[PDB]
Amino acid sequence: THTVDAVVIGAGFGGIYAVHKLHHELGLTTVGFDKADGPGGTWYWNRYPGALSDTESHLYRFSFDRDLLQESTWKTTYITQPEILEYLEDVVDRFDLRRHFKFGTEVTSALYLDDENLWEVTTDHGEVYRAKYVVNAVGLLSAINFPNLPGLDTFEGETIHTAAWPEGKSLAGRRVGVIGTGSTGQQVITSLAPEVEHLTVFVRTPQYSVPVGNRPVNPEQIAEIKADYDRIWERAKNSAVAFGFEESTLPAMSVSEEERNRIFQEAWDHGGGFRFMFGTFGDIATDEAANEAAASFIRAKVAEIIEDPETARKLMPKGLFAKRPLCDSGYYEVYNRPNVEAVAIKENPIREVTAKGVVTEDGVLHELDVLVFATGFDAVDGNYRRIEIRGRDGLHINDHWDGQPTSYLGVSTANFPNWFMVLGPNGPFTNLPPSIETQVEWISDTIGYAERNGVRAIEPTPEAEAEWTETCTEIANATLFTKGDSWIFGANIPGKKPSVLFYLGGLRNYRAVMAEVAADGYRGFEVKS
Ligand SMILES: Cc1cc2nc3c(=O)[nH]c(=O)nc-3n(C[C@H](O)[C@H](O)[C@H](O)COP(=O)(O)OP(=O)(O)OC[C@H]3O[C@@H](n4cnc5c(N)ncnc54)[C@H](O)[C@@H]3O)c2cc1C
Numbered sequence: 001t002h003t004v005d006a007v008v009i010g011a012g013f014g015g016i017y018a019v020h021k022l023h024h025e026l027g028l029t030t031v032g033f034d035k036a037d038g039p040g041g042t043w044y045w046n047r048y049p050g051a052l053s054d055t056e057s058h059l060y061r062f063s064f065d066r067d068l069l070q071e072s073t074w075k076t077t078y079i080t081q082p083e084i085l086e087y088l089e090d091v092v093d094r095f096d097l098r099r100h101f102k103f104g105t106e107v108t109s110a111l112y113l114d115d116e117n118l119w120e121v122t123t124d125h126g127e128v129y130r131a132k133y134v135v136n137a138v139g140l141l142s143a144i145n146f147p148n149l150p151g152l153d154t155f156e157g158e159t160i161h162t163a164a165w166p167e168g169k170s171l172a173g174r175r176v177g178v179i180g181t182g183s184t185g186q187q188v189i190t191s192l193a194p195e196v197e198h199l200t201v202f203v204r205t206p207q208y209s210v211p212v213g214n215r216p217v218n219p220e221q222i223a224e225i226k227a228d229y230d231r232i233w234e235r236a237k238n239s240a241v242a243f244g245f246e247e248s249t250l251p252a253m254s255v256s257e258e259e260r261n262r263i264f265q266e267a268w269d270h271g272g273g274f275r276f277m278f279g280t281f282g283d284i285a286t287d288e289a290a291n292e293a294a295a296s297f298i299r300a301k302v303a304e305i306i307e308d309p310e311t312a313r314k315l316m317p318k319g320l321f322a323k324r325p326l327c328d329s330g331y332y333e334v335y336n337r338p339n340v341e342a343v344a345i346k347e348n349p350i351r352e353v354t355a356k357g358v359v360t361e362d363g364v365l366h367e368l369d370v371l372v373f374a375t376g377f378d379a380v381d382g383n384y385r386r387i388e389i390r391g392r393d394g395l396h397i398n399d400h401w402d403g404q405p406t407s408y409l410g411v412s413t414a415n416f417p418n419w420f421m422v423l424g425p426n427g428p429f430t431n432l433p434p435s436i437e438t439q440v441e442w443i444s445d446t447i448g449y450a451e452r453n454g455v456r457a458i459e460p461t462p463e464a465e466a467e468w469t470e471t472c473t474e475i476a477n478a479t480l481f482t483k484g485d486s487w488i489f490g491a492n493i494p495g496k497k498p499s500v501l502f503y504l505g506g507l508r509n510y511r512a513v514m515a516e517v518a519a520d521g522y523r524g525f526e527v528k529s
């Protein structure tokens, strides 16, 4: 039983920064934990081939330390998993953080002790810590989703989830199946196709994707970025999604067809999924006709790329362009390869997995050495629901969030005093590092304020929390993303109640809300002295 000021759960971007603020700016005794053997979070787990950010390299990082920003370098316009991991290990060493963390150590329970006004946190090695504050940075795309298939456990080959890819494992020369064609599946398929002996893709919902445009960067282009870094970050912080481009306000149907095509073509040539969805016109996410113009443009490209009409039919995206926008380094062109087969599982479902592979309902065995599951995540709330977390009077997080998960401001919830979340439910949907920093900075200020002012507990009221839920819901219902049927609204997991899970007002609005709450003496919080 060690006693400390603060516990941080997670050693991704969130947890790394939170330990830094709580320790060096607030002078609090702070311990961090990760199940992982080192820092990096997402970029520690997802070592699958092709893993690559869709935020441009110069913005997928911390902004808080002006010297670090001048020191870091990168090879290309987007940054790969090993490069991000190295960046994060460098942050941890640069700021002497490593000593706060217990790696290979899962937090298994966190229990609030009403009389003592402390959290009791236990690890899977039986260590017990008591803390005044808990900061949860457990990842909104971290709890793996791994569907059961009939017969899966008779399979004699290897099975791998992409977000648990063992470092070093290569599938070169093997016969491989991939289940999943979201952001991960596209990357893994594109990068496996040239090295595997045969690839079979099991596609349930083909998605819309545009080119990433990942180009080599020399040490000069990067010099110009580094020379304007202050303004770069100021604009990012004052945009909606903080991806580094100007979010358009131009309505798509207010220009001619010719011009519309030209604007989409320029975005397509330039690259980037978010730029396609938000850099071109201002209403692709809120107006049906604007959505359909963007969708048709992409469908027409698929048609020109994939040469076999039957293959193209199976890969043709349909319906609203309303999932997380995807981009790729040659995904659709993979299906022109003779060692790649697409299996459209909505029309030819999986019958079962047997010793040697996957059998479809047409009676064909797809013979496979390895099955890769790019089946995504129990997003946002999944890592909370899996830990034993109990608040005031032993209320379990799963009974508190008995239906949808909720927060006040994305960083707190009622009945859990002195307990904060980084990227909890109902927070911003943006390039995430600058949102993580907004939240960590705001939590650190709040804890600092509590310590200075002798506050014993802070927690949001149920009224404020309900208002925040309603605000998220209203903003969501004004967009088409409601009908996209993906992880973003909890619709990807059998047994998960679909719900709003994000505040979609953008980083500029989010930051203004957060700063006003703090300037106003923590409006919506109950504060006990
Ligand atoms: C393949 C991939 C690509 C992505 N690309 C982008 C992108 O381009 N742009 C973008 O903005 N976002 C992207 N994301 C989202 C990305 O997760 C965030 O950018 C960011 O890495 C989140 O960092 P985090 O610290 O909040 O959580 P994570 O990096 O998910 O770290 C959470 C950590 O908590 C640990 N943990 C959880 N529960 C426990 C427990 N009980 N005890 C101990 N440890 C625990 C986990 O092991 C994990 O290491 C991507 C995600 C994935 C999976």
Ligand SMILES: NC(=O)c1ccc[n+]([C@@H]2O[C@H](COP(=O)([O-])OP(=O)(O)OC[C@H]3O[C@@H](n4cnc5c(N)ncnc54)[C@H](OP(=O)(O)O)[C@@H]3O)[C@@H](O)[C@H]2O)c1
Pocket (backbone or CB within 6 Å): 052, 053, 054, 055, 141, 147, 179, 180, 181, 182, 183, 184, 185, 187, 204, 205, 324, 374, 375, 376, 377, 486, 487, 492
């Ligand atoms: N920066 C990047 O380039 C990058 C890369 C990877 C991940 N990410 C982030 O991580 C998020 C999640 O991405 P992801 O691709 O891992 O997950 P995802 O978008 O949730 O996609 C999961 C895929 O698995 C399929 N699937 C799920 N269950 C299945 C089942 N039982 N049988 C057959 N198919 C099944 C889904 O089909 P349906 O659509 O039919 O459900 C979908 O194609 C992304 O949206 C993005 O935010 C980003």
Ligand SMILES: O=C1CCCCCO1
Pocket (backbone or CB within 6 Å): 054, 429, 430, 431, 432
């Ligand atoms: O890939 C990501 C993570 C989901 C939320 C913002 C979009 O960028």
